[PDB]
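pls ignore typos typing on phone
M5P + seq
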Amino acid sequence: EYPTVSEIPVGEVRLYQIADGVWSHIATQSFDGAVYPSNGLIVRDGDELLLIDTAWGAKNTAALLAEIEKQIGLPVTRAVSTHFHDDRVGGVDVLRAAGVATYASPSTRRLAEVEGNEIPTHSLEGLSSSGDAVRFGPVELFYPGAAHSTDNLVVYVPSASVLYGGCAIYELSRTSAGNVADADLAEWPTSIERIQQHYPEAQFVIPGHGLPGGLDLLKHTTNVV
Ligand SMILES: O=C(O)[C@@H](CS)CCCc1ccccc1
Ligand SMILES: [Zn+2]
Ligand SMILES: [Zn+2]
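k done
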């Protein structure tokens, strides 16, 4: 039922209900010769929607807003990028032009400026040190320390016990490290434990790529790194 990579043509976006007020958006994009699926989060925020990450590109993100408009019908007013890679910030310009206020930690914003990626407009205070947490509307943002990247944040929806781990967290079927050029391998396992120790009542854990799982996904990631 969860959409797979061969089912989403590059340019299209699917929405998947995870609990109500919480959806994940799935898009596809090529990366060094191959196409991969990628997840993001959507959270109902009163009469508005909070977006967690872009759909990996300008055209995909445009498709995302259109799909949101078609299936949910509420405006996306804010977005948070969980790290500096293009599958997280690629498309913030389309979001900006659509009236969406974009956010990211200052760490993410400068890591994106130096790599030449799109840069979220606003800086998120209170997450510069491992273990820091801040609330942001219907969700709580957490900076566990360097893992997939040195700036990676994870997101938690209290009212739904949904833990969005981003690309610091791997799906279950993934048994190899893959690309970790921007990671801190030595610290990764420690950052994940910080996540474990911080959201032990998580019911759903969404990886940055692939199928949903449980807290089950954390140790699996450590074991793969
Ligand atoms: O820039 C990067 O290093 C990554 C963005 S998270 C590319 C992700 C592509 C991919 C996603 C999941 C598994 C293997 C490859
Ligand atoms: Zn990444
Ligand atoms: Zn990723």
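The CA atoms of residues 36 and 216 lie 22 Å apart. The longest strand covers residues 34-45. more later
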